[PDB]
């Protein structure tokens, strides 16, 4: 009865930019992860600290789902330990990450002949993001600490768009990513598999 709403995470119409990634807390339902691992349409399917295969036998406190778009060559940065512009400045998995990383090609939805520029990423910041931190700001970044009123030299626009073209190479093509994070605190189990 209490079928967990993974279909509205995965089959949602629009995904957000990676700098402005979006979280759905999922609790207090019954889960069927076999909807995920039966399918062959994922290009990335990696689970850390837990097999996908055994997920229907476990019970968890909170399951979080995090979603965003990256270009194809950036999907590798959504893994524990990795660095680069996406891990450093947009979305960061912790070292002791428990969960899955799920990605599929969306060149049919999210590219264009002229170029899709709707998906942004941050490329500079004062520090690296902590695990699961988020930076939504629209400021001018000064390397020293000065006030900047216009984007100039030593006064940086910190955001840049991906440009998604339909004819591009597969590493420059858009990919929707869903990151499933699993907790089971001293809290009672709210999410369970069918078994």
């Amino acid at each position, epitope marked *: 009865t209490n079928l967990c709403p993974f279909g509205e995470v995965f089959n949602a119409t629009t995904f957000p930019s990676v700098y402005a990634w979006e979280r759905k807390r999922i609790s207090n339902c019954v889960a069927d992860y076999s909807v995920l691992y039966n399918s062959t349409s994922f290009s990335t399917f990696k689970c850390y600290g837990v097999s996908a295969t055994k997920l229907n036998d476990l019970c968890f406190s909170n399951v979080y789902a995090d979603s965003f778009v990256v270009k194809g*060559d950036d999907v590798r940065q959504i893994a524990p330990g990795q660095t680069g512009v996406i891990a450093d400045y947009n979305y960061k998995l912790p*070292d002791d990450f428990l969960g899955c990383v799920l990605a599929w090609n969306t060149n049919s939805k999210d590219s264009s002949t002229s170029g899709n520029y709707n998906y942004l990423y941050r490329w500079v910041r004062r520090s690296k993001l902590n695990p699961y931190e988020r930076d939504l700001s629209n400021d001018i970044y000064s390397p020293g600490g000065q006030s900047c009123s216009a984007v100039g030299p030593n006064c940086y626009n910190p955001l840049r768009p991906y440009g998604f073209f339909t004819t591009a190479g597969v590493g420059h093509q858009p990919y929707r990513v869903v990151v499933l994070s699993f907790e089971l605190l001293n809290a009672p189990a709210t999410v369970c598999g069918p078994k």
Partner: antibody, heavy 130, light 111 residues
Framework: QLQLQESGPGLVKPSETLSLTCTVSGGSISSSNFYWGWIRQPPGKGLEWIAS???????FYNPSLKSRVAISVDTSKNQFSLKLSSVTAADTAVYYCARTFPSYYDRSGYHYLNYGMDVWGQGTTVTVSS | NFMLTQPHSMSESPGKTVTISCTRS????????VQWYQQRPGSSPTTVIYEDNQRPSGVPDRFSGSIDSSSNSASLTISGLKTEDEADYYC?????????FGGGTKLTVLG
């Protein structure tokens, strides 16, 4: 940003035990998503893998070195260590410590683990001589 | 316990594209992940390709990896070859028994 620093004896007499320590910073040796290993390079030659370990104590060895190799982790000092017993001149090499790419399961349930090196240390030169 | 074979050296002009191949002696090259390591003189090795074709951050977009099962081989490919790419390149894989390294390819930029 992870860094790895080898420290070792520099000179070691033949038949004795070579003892090396890698000191982790920017991360914890306790992190059970990763393995941590030792690679060596004799002067003039390429690379040979020695052993790898994770926080539990689970260990993989090069089968030709295994009877002479001991590898351990020390979570209390953020270190892991290698001992290579009964050295000869064929163990003269630069020794590198390293962290692997993280272990993970695929959709079918296969466990990928300890398959390749991601962050390398700077190397420590070991000479075996009388 | 298989071996992996690399050319001892490789020579190409700047701007051209060069490919170091790594041929697995027994088993299938596609059964296990292939890594590529670059080593300059005097330096520790650096990983430039992992999982056959994944490129860590800081390695140029010109470096690319690929697998060819009809010749049972893997390939590092450097496009737009630069003076700065002169180094030794080692491939590496593994089975259930051990990791296996290539013997290394000395890459020389000509002209």
């Amino acid at each position: 940003q992870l860094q790895l620093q080898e420290s070792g004896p520099g000179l070691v007499k033949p038949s004795e035990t070579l003892s090396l320590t890698c000191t982790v910073s920017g991360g914890s040796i306790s992190s059970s998503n990763f393995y941590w290993g030792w690679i060596r390079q004799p002067p003039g030659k390429g690379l040979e893998w020695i052993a790898s370990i994770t926080y539990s104590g689970r260990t993989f060895y090069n089968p030709s070195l295994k009877s002479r190799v001991a590898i351990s982790v020390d979570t209390s000092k953020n270190q892991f260590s290698l001992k290579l017993s009964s050295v000869t001149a064929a163990d003269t090499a630069v020794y590198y410590c390293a962290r692997t790419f993280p272990s993970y399961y695929d959709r079918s349930g296969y466990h990928y683990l300890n398959y390749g090196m991601d962050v390398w240390g700077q190397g420590t030169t070991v000479t075996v001589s009388s | 316990n298989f071996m992996l074979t690399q050319p001892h050296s490789m020579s190409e002009s700047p701007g051209k594209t060069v490919t170091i191949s790594c041929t697995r002696s027994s088993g299938s090259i596609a059964s296990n992940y292939v890594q590529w390591y670059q080593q300059r003189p005097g330096s520790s090795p650096t990983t430039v390709i992992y999982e056959d074709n994944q490129r860590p951050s800081g390695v140029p977009d010109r470096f690319s990896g690929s697998i060819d099962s009809s010749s049972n081989s893997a390939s590092l490919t450097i496009s737009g070859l630069k003076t700065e790419d002169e180094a030794d390149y080692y491939c590496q894989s593994y089975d259930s028994s051990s990791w296996v390294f290539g013997g290394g390819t000395k890459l020389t930029v000509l002209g």
